Amino acid sequence: QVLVLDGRGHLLGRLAAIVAKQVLLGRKVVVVRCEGINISGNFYRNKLKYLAFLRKRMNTNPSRGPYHFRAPSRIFWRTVRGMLPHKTKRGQAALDRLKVFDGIPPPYDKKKRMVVPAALKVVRLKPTRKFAYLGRLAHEVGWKYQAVTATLEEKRKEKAKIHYRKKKQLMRLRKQAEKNVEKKIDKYTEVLKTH
Amino acid sequence: IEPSLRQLAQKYNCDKMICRKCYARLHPRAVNCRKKKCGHTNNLRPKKKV
Amino acid sequence: MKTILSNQTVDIPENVDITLKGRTVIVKGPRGTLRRDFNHINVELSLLGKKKKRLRVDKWWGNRKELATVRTICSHVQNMIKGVTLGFRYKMRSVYAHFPINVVIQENGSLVEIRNFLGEKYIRRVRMRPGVACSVSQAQKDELILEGNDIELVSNSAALIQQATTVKNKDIRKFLDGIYVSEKGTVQQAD
Amino acid sequence: FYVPAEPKLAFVIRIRGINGVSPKVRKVLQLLRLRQIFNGTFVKLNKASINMLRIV
Amino acid sequence: VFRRFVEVGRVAYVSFGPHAGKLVAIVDVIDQNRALVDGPCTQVRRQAMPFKCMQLTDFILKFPHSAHQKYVRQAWQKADINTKWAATRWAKKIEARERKAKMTDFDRFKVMKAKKMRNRIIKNEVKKLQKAALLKASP
Amino acid sequence: MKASGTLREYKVVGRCLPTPKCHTPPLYRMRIFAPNHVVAKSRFWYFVSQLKKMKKSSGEIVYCGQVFEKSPLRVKNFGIWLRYDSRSGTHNMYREYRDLTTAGAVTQCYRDMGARHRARAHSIQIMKVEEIAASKCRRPAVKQFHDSKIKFPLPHRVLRRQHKPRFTTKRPNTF
RNA sequence: CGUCGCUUUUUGAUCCUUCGAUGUCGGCUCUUCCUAUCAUUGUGAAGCAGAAUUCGCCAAGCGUUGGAUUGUUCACCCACU
RNA sequence: AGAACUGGCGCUGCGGGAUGAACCGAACGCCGGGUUAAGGCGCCCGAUGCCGACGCUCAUCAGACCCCAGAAAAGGUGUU
């Protein structure tokens, strides 16, 4: 139906190309928590070429023209758009299967999130080299919603502990229950063929 | 004045090496300017005494 | 080159006990405790053996700028060992021309209020890094003493004073005025 | 060391195309009967035929 | 941290490559990413496999530095690796991973009927432990 | 030469033809490293013409066989001599590797000259290759594997992406 | 004494474009851009005592005028800054 | 600006060089299957979604493919 990608620990370009192909193949993909997407090169380097991006400004009226987005959701959304044929109506419809969310909204906070090990910083960068966070190059460039998001993450993650705390309550119980066996006639055929 | 303290101020203000290209204020046993703008060059002169 | 490992060790005396959570190191000693995280530096640490307490930092894989940081690790532990038993004391002295420097402490040995520097009206209030102590000397003219456990909180705070007494728009080779550091010592002596 | 006879025939195929071709080298290709690309031909090996194959 | 190394004599599992799924004995590390290996009692002969091919196990073998096939053959079956390798929890998992791959359609039916049976049994039993857990907390 | 793939050592002998002036010329011998035997007897007439007054028209080869190392299982330390060309001038070079075969150690040269010195394989001339025994190595990168009871772990392992589900719910441990 | 470069604000060289036509000097007016920075911010260096200056660095945010002669661009002068 | 030699463009499409008169492949009746040249294979964009091999390099102006669309002398205890 729809896949949900957690975005932290991933690279900017390695994730957004895989989103750009999976969204051309008919799926509905939703990338959540695109605040902590890493991007290679140190922070002062990547903050330069975003400031160079901001002055690409049409001279005669900047109102029409290049729309510099600053939230790291639409930074990630604009990266996918440059890897799509958005001037065609097949490339328009590809963007409508992408819905990107910064932070974690309540339709998407209780789903299970997937990661892409192609795009992870742990996978793909050599560990002795420097990387930039997309959250604080957005915060350095006009994104005025870092504090109101990082408040709502710890309100979100505190509610997620008390779920997981009581989940491992539940599976301590059904593991203590399956000690009370009474069923080893059925345990023959699963251990025989990979329980 | 206090000539024991007069030497201690000159340790931070006069006893240094100046580069002819980056113009930096380096340290008295430099061989190269640390600043990248000259390409870490190796022509240094002592800071001129009064 | 990618050499097989290098390793320095750091011996630990008895009153200090180093425990490590990971690449984070917790150093408890007599005169307090302090901790440093090295989660950027890609090396393993190993304290080995009861009753002798040896810390073994070694890097198995690596290049020449990755080999240079294995000594920087062990030389930061020995500033945590020395500073948690002896402490650090950076005595610094005021050098002045015609105008005497008036230096006082406002807030509990943390804020430093410098006035009459070079005859100027502008006070210069220096708030320090948390963990040092301000103290004007006794049995010495115009000497200021900073004391604490951690060297980088002592030394950076001793740099804020010397940087604040900076003569501007003048010849800096005459006009030798400033509160310069003069001695790098310990709080407890000779241990 | 028994050195064999250097061989008596060759099988010559053409691998380059038709256009942009010097007039000496499109005469010998006409003589070896190699006109289209990827055409092969058995050739007698001789002094007269080896020195054609250096032209081409 | 770094609880198992390569070493002269280290028994390694070979994950991919032309010998995928067989143990080897590391004989000599040759240059930085390639190691001279053999398995005398597990049908893989002497060559240099790359390190990213192999998986380190936790069996060491005390044979000399770069001996012949014979002394490695002695040390493999003095230590009796093959029974110890079957009696480990990691080769049980690669045994279990291939039993699930060769599962026929009739067995997969029989697994299904015996899987959905015992999960009724626990669910009708784990509800009983919930039922007594509130019954402690109600007084 | 392309140095295509792993190389293969050839022993190539050959002699200039018997003129009416000269009967039985001495049948020189070289040691050609080449990817196949057709390149191998082509480099013989490159190297002989720089050393003697011989060429392919007035000469022939009288052997071209693959000569292969006796000990493919024993680890050997190779020291080779180079004559590459640079962008400005040309330089002589000694250079040490450590492989199980002779053609694999000279293959490890051509890759390494292109890596470090950007030297394309037509501009580099192998002079001689032989095994040396230990404690006559000078290179500390080859010397550091001479250690009985050597040991080292494998830190930070990374491989097999897209091999498994590209999309997983599982942050892959690098051990 | 050499010698290596950049720029197209000078002039040339060229003749590719426009001869069923692209309105041709300067001034006025108004906008924006470049930095190879005159001033202004923060600095480094002097044969920097202070004052005034000079040489360099990040740097184009902001300023860089009023007149006599002259069609002038340019020039030259008066005066402020 | 003017010659020589061969090819080309002008008269000529097609694949590749983002774009293009001449470059590199290659020449054309209308089609189906097969295969390749030059070129390529993160995603636009067909094909590396190979458990590719070995090294080199960190740039506060990185670099990145004939013709071809930007640079030198000199210098660097930056690494090899």
From Swiss-Prot, chain A:
What species is given as this protein's source?
A: Homo sapiens
Citrulline PTM positions: 55, 136
Gene Ontology process terms (BP): cellular response to type II interferon; cytoplasmic translation; homeostatic process; lung morphogenesis; macrophage chemotaxis; negative regulation of formation of translation preinitiation complex; negative regulation of translation; positive regulation of natural killer cell proliferation
Q: Which residues carry this modification: N6-acetyllysine?
A: 187
Give residue numbers for the modification (Phosphoserine). Answer: 73
Q: Which gene name does the record give?
A: RPL13A
* A GO term, aspect molecular function: RNA binding
- Entry-linked HAMAP family: Ribosomal_uL13
Protein's name in the database: Large ribosomal subunit protein uL13
From Swiss-Prot, chain B:
Q: Its domain of life?
A: Eukaryota
Q: Which residues carry this modification: N6,N6,N6-trimethyllysine?
A: 21
PTM text: Trimethylation of Lys-21 ('Lys-22' of the mature chain) by SMYD5 promotes translation elongation and protein synthesis.
Location of the protein in the cell: Cytoplasm
Q: What is the effect of changing residue 21 to R/A?
A: Abolished methylation by SMYD5, leading to decreased translation initiation and protein synthesis
The task this protein performs is described as:
Component of the 60S subunit of the ribosome. Ribosomal protein L40 is essential for translation of a subset of cellular transcripts, and especially for cap-dependent translation of vesicular stomatitis virus mRNAs.
Q: What is this protein called?
A: Large ribosomal subunit protein eL40
UniProtKB/Swiss-Prot annotation, chain C:
Tell me which domain of life the UniProt entry assigns to the organism this sequence originates from. Eukaryota
What keywords would UniProt list here? Acetylation, Cytoplasm, Ribonucleoprotein, Ribosomal protein
Name its cellular compartments: Cytoplasm
The main location is cytoplasm
Give the molecular function GO annotations: RNA binding; rRNA binding; structural constituent of ribosome
Q: Name one GO cellular component term.
A: cytoplasm
**SUPFAM superfamilies xref list:** Ribosomal protein L6
Q: Which InterPro entries match?
A: Ribosomal_uL6-like (IPR000702), Ribosomal_uL6-like_a/b-dom_sf (IPR036789), Ribosomal_uL6_a/b-dom (IPR020040), Ribosomal_uL6_CS2 (IPR002359)
Residues with N6-acetyllysine modification: 121
Q: Could you state one GO biological process linked to this protein?
A: translation
Subunit-level organization? Component of the large ribosomal subunit.
Q: What does this protein do?
A: Component of the large ribosomal subunit. The ribosome is a large ribonucleoprotein complex responsible for the synthesis of proteins in the cell.
Family designation: Belongs to the universal ribosomal protein uL6 family.
Q: What is this protein called?
A: Large ribosomal subunit protein uL6
What is the species listed in this Swiss-Prot or TrEMBL entry? Homo sapiens (Human)
UniProtKB/Swiss-Prot annotation, chain D:
- Cellular location(s): Cytoplasm
Keywords noted in UniProt: Acetylation, Cytoplasm, Phosphoprotein, Repeat, Ribonucleoprotein, Ribosomal protein, RNA-binding
Cellular component, GO annotation: cytoplasm; cytosol; cytosolic large ribosomal subunit; cytosolic ribosome; endoplasmic reticulum; focal adhesion; membrane; nucleolus
Q: Which residues carry this modification: N6-succinyllysine?
A: 47
Give any GO molecular function from the UniProt entry. Answer: RNA binding
Q: From its record, what is one biological process in GO terms?
A: rRNA processing
In-chain residues carrying the UniProt-annotated modification N6-acetyllysine: 44
The record describes its quaternary structure and partners as:
Component of the large ribosomal subunit. Homodimer. Interacts with DHX33.
Q: What does this protein do?
A: Component of the large ribosomal subunit. The ribosome is a large ribonucleoprotein complex responsible for the synthesis of proteins in the cell. Binds to G-rich structures in 28S rRNA and in mRNAs. Plays a regulatory role in the translation apparatus; inhibits cell-free translation of mRNAs.
Family classification: Belongs to the universal ribosomal protein uL30 family.
Q: What is this protein called?
A: Large ribosomal subunit protein uL30
**UniProt organism field:** Homo sapiens
Ranked from the top, the taxonomy reads: Eukaryota, Metazoa, Chordata, Craniata, Vertebrata
The gene designation is RPL7
Residue span relative to the full protein = 81 to 136 of 248
